[PDB]
Short mmCIF file of all heavy atoms in Angstrom, two decimals:
data_model
loop_
_atom_site.label_atom_id
_atom_site.label_comp_id
_atom_site.label_asym_id
_atom_site.label_seq_id
_atom_site.Cartn_x
_atom_site.Cartn_y
_atom_site.Cartn_z
N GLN A 42 91.81 125.78 101.20
CA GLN A 42 91.51 124.44 100.69
C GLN A 42 92.65 123.47 100.89
O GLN A 42 92.41 122.26 100.91
CB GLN A 42 91.21 124.45 99.20
CG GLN A 42 89.88 124.97 98.82
CD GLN A 42 89.34 124.28 97.57
OE1 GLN A 42 88.33 123.57 97.63
NE2 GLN A 42 90.03 124.44 96.45
N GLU A 43 93.73 123.90 101.00
CA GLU A 43 94.87 122.98 100.99
C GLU A 43 95.31 122.64 102.40
O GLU A 43 95.34 123.52 103.27
CB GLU A 43 96.06 123.61 100.25
CG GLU A 43 95.82 124.18 98.84
CD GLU A 43 95.18 125.57 98.80
OE1 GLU A 43 94.68 126.04 99.85
OE2 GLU A 43 95.24 126.23 97.73
N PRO A 44 95.66 121.38 102.68
CA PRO A 44 96.24 121.05 103.98
C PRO A 44 97.56 121.77 104.17
O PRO A 44 98.30 122.05 103.22
CB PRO A 44 96.44 119.53 103.91
CG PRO A 44 95.57 119.08 102.80
CD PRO A 44 95.54 120.19 101.82
N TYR A 45 97.86 122.07 105.43
CA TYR A 45 99.13 122.71 105.75
C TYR A 45 100.29 121.80 105.38
O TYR A 45 100.18 120.57 105.35
CB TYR A 45 99.17 123.08 107.24
CG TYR A 45 98.27 124.25 107.55
CD1 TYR A 45 97.06 124.07 108.24
CD2 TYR A 45 98.62 125.54 107.16
CE1 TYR A 45 96.24 125.15 108.52
CE2 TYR A 45 97.81 126.61 107.45
CZ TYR A 45 96.63 126.42 108.12
OH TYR A 45 95.84 127.51 108.38
N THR A 46 101.42 122.42 105.04
CA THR A 46 102.56 121.66 104.56
C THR A 46 103.23 120.94 105.71
O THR A 46 103.39 121.50 106.79
CB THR A 46 103.56 122.58 103.89
OG1 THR A 46 102.90 123.30 102.84
CG2 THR A 46 104.74 121.78 103.35
N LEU A 47 103.58 119.68 105.48
CA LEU A 47 104.32 118.85 106.42
C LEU A 47 105.76 118.68 105.95
O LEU A 47 106.07 118.91 104.77
CB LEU A 47 103.65 117.48 106.59
CG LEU A 47 102.44 117.51 107.52
CD1 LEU A 47 101.82 116.13 107.64
CD2 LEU A 47 102.87 118.02 108.88
N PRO A 48 106.68 118.30 106.83
CA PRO A 48 108.04 118.01 106.37
C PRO A 48 108.02 116.92 105.31
O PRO A 48 107.06 116.14 105.17
CB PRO A 48 108.76 117.54 107.64
CG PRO A 48 107.94 118.07 108.78
CD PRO A 48 106.53 118.06 108.28
N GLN A 49 109.10 116.89 104.53
CA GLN A 49 109.26 115.87 103.50
C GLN A 49 109.10 114.48 104.11
O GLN A 49 109.60 114.21 105.19
CB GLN A 49 110.63 116.03 102.85
CG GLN A 49 110.74 115.40 101.48
CD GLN A 49 111.19 116.43 100.46
OE1 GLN A 49 110.90 117.63 100.60
NE2 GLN A 49 111.91 115.99 99.44
N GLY A 50 108.34 113.62 103.42
CA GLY A 50 108.22 112.22 103.83
C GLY A 50 107.09 111.90 104.80
O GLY A 50 106.93 110.73 105.17
N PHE A 51 106.30 112.89 105.20
CA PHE A 51 105.15 112.74 106.09
C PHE A 51 103.87 113.10 105.34
O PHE A 51 103.90 113.86 104.37
CB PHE A 51 105.27 113.61 107.33
CG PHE A 51 106.47 113.32 108.17
CD1 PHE A 51 107.73 113.83 107.81
CD2 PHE A 51 106.36 112.58 109.32
CE1 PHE A 51 108.84 113.58 108.59
CE2 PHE A 51 107.48 112.33 110.12
CZ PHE A 51 108.73 112.84 109.74
N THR A 52 102.76 112.53 105.78
CA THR A 52 101.49 112.79 105.11
C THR A 52 100.40 112.91 106.16
O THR A 52 100.52 112.39 107.27
CB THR A 52 101.17 111.67 104.10
OG1 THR A 52 100.02 112.03 103.32
CG2 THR A 52 100.88 110.36 104.81
N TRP A 53 99.35 113.65 105.80
CA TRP A 53 98.10 113.74 106.55
C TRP A 53 97.26 112.48 106.33
O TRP A 53 97.50 111.70 105.40
CB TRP A 53 97.28 114.97 106.15
CG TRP A 53 97.91 116.26 106.51
CD1 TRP A 53 98.41 117.19 105.65
CD2 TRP A 53 98.11 116.78 107.83
NE1 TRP A 53 98.91 118.26 106.35
CE2 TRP A 53 98.74 118.03 107.69
CE3 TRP A 53 97.80 116.31 109.11
CZ2 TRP A 53 99.09 118.83 108.79
CZ3 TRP A 53 98.15 117.11 110.21
CH2 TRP A 53 98.79 118.34 110.04
N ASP A 54 96.28 112.28 107.22
CA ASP A 54 95.35 111.15 107.09
C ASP A 54 94.08 111.45 107.86
O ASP A 54 94.10 112.19 108.85
CB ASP A 54 95.98 109.84 107.58
CG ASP A 54 95.27 108.61 107.02
OD1 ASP A 54 94.37 108.75 106.17
OD2 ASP A 54 95.67 107.47 107.38
N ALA A 55 92.96 110.98 107.33
CA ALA A 55 91.68 110.97 108.05
C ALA A 55 91.38 109.53 108.48
O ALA A 55 90.86 108.74 107.69
CB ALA A 55 90.58 111.54 107.17
N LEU A 56 91.70 109.19 109.73
CA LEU A 56 91.58 107.81 110.18
C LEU A 56 90.12 107.38 110.30
O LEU A 56 89.32 108.03 110.98
CB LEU A 56 92.28 107.58 111.52
CG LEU A 56 93.80 107.59 111.59
CD1 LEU A 56 94.48 108.84 110.97
CD2 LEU A 56 94.25 107.34 113.02
N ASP A 57 89.78 106.27 109.65
CA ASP A 57 88.44 105.70 109.73
C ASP A 57 88.47 104.64 110.82
O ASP A 57 88.94 103.52 110.60
CB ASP A 57 88.03 105.11 108.39
CG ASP A 57 86.76 104.33 108.48
OD1 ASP A 57 85.90 104.66 109.33
OD2 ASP A 57 86.62 103.36 107.69
N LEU A 58 88.01 105.01 112.02
CA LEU A 58 88.10 104.13 113.18
C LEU A 58 87.16 102.93 113.09
O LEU A 58 87.28 102.02 113.92
CB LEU A 58 87.83 104.93 114.45
CG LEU A 58 88.70 106.18 114.63
CD1 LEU A 58 88.38 106.84 115.95
CD2 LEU A 58 90.18 105.87 114.54
N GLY A 59 86.23 102.91 112.13
CA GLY A 59 85.43 101.72 111.90
C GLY A 59 86.23 100.56 111.33
O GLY A 59 85.86 99.40 111.53
N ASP A 60 87.32 100.85 110.63
CA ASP A 60 88.27 99.83 110.24
C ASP A 60 89.12 99.46 111.46
O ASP A 60 89.76 100.34 112.06
CB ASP A 60 89.15 100.33 109.09
CG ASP A 60 90.16 99.30 108.64
OD1 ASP A 60 91.11 99.00 109.42
OD2 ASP A 60 90.00 98.78 107.51
N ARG A 61 89.11 98.18 111.84
CA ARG A 61 89.77 97.77 113.08
C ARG A 61 91.29 97.86 112.99
O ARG A 61 91.95 98.02 114.02
CB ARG A 61 89.34 96.35 113.48
CG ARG A 61 87.96 96.28 114.18
CD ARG A 61 87.90 97.03 115.54
NE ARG A 61 88.11 96.13 116.68
CZ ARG A 61 89.29 95.92 117.27
NH1 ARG A 61 90.40 96.55 116.84
NH2 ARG A 61 89.37 95.07 118.29
N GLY A 62 91.86 97.73 111.79
CA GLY A 62 93.30 97.93 111.64
C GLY A 62 93.72 99.36 111.92
O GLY A 62 94.69 99.62 112.65
N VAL A 63 92.96 100.32 111.38
CA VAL A 63 93.18 101.73 111.66
C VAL A 63 93.02 102.00 113.15
O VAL A 63 93.90 102.59 113.79
CB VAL A 63 92.21 102.59 110.84
CG1 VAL A 63 92.27 104.05 111.29
CG2 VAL A 63 92.51 102.44 109.36
N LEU A 64 91.93 101.50 113.75
CA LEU A 64 91.68 101.71 115.17
C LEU A 64 92.85 101.20 116.01
O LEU A 64 93.31 101.89 116.93
CB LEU A 64 90.36 101.02 115.57
CG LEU A 64 89.85 101.06 117.02
CD1 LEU A 64 89.50 102.47 117.49
CD2 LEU A 64 88.65 100.14 117.24
N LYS A 65 93.39 100.03 115.67
CA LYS A 65 94.52 99.46 116.40
C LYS A 65 95.80 100.28 116.20
O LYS A 65 96.66 100.30 117.08
CB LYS A 65 94.71 98.00 115.96
CG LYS A 65 95.90 97.27 116.58
CD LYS A 65 96.63 96.44 115.52
CE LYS A 65 97.13 97.33 114.35
NZ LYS A 65 97.29 96.65 113.03
N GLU A 66 95.95 100.96 115.05
CA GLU A 66 97.09 101.87 114.88
C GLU A 66 96.98 103.06 115.84
O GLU A 66 97.94 103.40 116.54
CB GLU A 66 97.16 102.33 113.42
CG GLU A 66 97.47 101.22 112.41
CD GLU A 66 97.27 101.65 110.96
OE1 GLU A 66 96.24 102.31 110.70
OE2 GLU A 66 98.10 101.32 110.07
N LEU A 67 95.79 103.66 115.92
CA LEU A 67 95.53 104.72 116.90
C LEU A 67 95.77 104.23 118.32
O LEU A 67 96.40 104.92 119.14
CB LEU A 67 94.09 105.20 116.79
CG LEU A 67 93.73 106.34 117.74
CD1 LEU A 67 94.71 107.52 117.56
CD2 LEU A 67 92.29 106.77 117.51
N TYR A 68 95.29 103.03 118.62
CA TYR A 68 95.43 102.51 119.97
C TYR A 68 96.90 102.33 120.34
O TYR A 68 97.32 102.71 121.44
CB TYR A 68 94.63 101.19 120.05
CG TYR A 68 95.08 100.26 121.15
CD1 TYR A 68 94.52 100.31 122.40
CD2 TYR A 68 96.10 99.35 120.94
CE1 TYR A 68 94.93 99.46 123.43
CE2 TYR A 68 96.54 98.50 121.96
CZ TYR A 68 95.96 98.56 123.21
OH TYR A 68 96.41 97.71 124.21
N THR A 69 97.70 101.81 119.40
CA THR A 69 99.13 101.65 119.63
C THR A 69 99.82 102.99 119.88
O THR A 69 100.63 103.12 120.82
CB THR A 69 99.79 100.96 118.42
OG1 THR A 69 99.15 99.70 118.13
CG2 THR A 69 101.28 100.71 118.67
N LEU A 70 99.50 104.01 119.08
CA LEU A 70 100.12 105.33 119.25
C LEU A 70 99.77 105.93 120.60
O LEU A 70 100.63 106.51 121.27
CB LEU A 70 99.68 106.30 118.15
CG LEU A 70 100.10 107.77 118.24
CD1 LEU A 70 101.47 108.06 117.56
CD2 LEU A 70 99.01 108.68 117.70
N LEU A 71 98.51 105.82 121.02
CA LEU A 71 98.13 106.48 122.26
C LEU A 71 98.77 105.80 123.47
O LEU A 71 99.27 106.48 124.37
CB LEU A 71 96.61 106.52 122.39
CG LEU A 71 95.93 107.35 121.32
CD1 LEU A 71 94.42 107.45 121.56
CD2 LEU A 71 96.57 108.75 121.24
N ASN A 72 98.78 104.47 123.52
CA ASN A 72 99.37 103.83 124.70
C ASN A 72 100.86 104.06 124.80
O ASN A 72 101.41 104.11 125.91
CB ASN A 72 99.07 102.34 124.70
CG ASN A 72 97.60 102.08 124.68
OD1 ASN A 72 96.81 102.72 125.40
ND2 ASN A 72 97.19 101.16 123.83
N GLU A 73 101.54 104.24 123.67
CA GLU A 73 102.99 104.39 123.72
C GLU A 73 103.43 105.84 123.75
O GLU A 73 104.59 106.10 124.09
CB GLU A 73 103.63 103.68 122.52
CG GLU A 73 103.52 102.16 122.63
CD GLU A 73 103.94 101.44 121.38
OE1 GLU A 73 104.69 102.02 120.57
OE2 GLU A 73 103.47 100.31 121.17
N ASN A 74 102.57 106.79 123.41
CA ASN A 74 103.02 108.17 123.31
C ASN A 74 102.09 109.20 123.95
O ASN A 74 102.38 110.39 123.87
CB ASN A 74 103.24 108.53 121.84
CG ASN A 74 104.23 107.60 121.16
OD1 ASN A 74 105.43 107.87 121.12
ND2 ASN A 74 103.73 106.48 120.65
N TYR A 75 101.01 108.80 124.62
CA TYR A 75 100.09 109.75 125.23
C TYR A 75 100.59 110.11 126.63
O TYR A 75 101.70 109.77 127.03
CB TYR A 75 98.66 109.22 125.23
CG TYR A 75 97.59 110.29 125.28
CD1 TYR A 75 97.61 111.36 124.39
CD2 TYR A 75 96.56 110.23 126.22
CE1 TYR A 75 96.63 112.34 124.44
CE2 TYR A 75 95.59 111.19 126.27
CZ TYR A 75 95.63 112.25 125.38
OH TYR A 75 94.65 113.21 125.43
N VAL A 76 99.74 110.81 127.39
CA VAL A 76 100.10 111.45 128.67
C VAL A 76 101.17 110.74 129.50
O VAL A 76 100.98 109.62 129.98
CB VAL A 76 98.81 111.63 129.53
CG1 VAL A 76 99.15 112.25 130.87
CG2 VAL A 76 97.77 112.49 128.81
#
């Protein structure tokens, strides 16, 4: 039941891509850190 432990100061999230602010956060991460 419990999410796996992350290092101190980090958290899990379930991104709701229907919110455009969330979607733009994902978009920023992928263009700057993907393949």
Side-chain angles (χ1 to χ4, degrees):
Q42 284 213 114
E43 308 81 347
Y45 288 107
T46 304
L47 281 179
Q49 201 124 331
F51 300 80
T52 188
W53 294 111
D54 201 6
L56 289 53
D57 171 30
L58 307 183
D60 180 292
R61 280 297 264 94
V63 171
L64 179 65
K65 177 223 58 207
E66 295 169 316
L67 182 55
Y68 157 91
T69 304
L70 173 90
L71 296 185
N72 302 316
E73 290 171 22
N74 303 268
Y75 204 50
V76 178

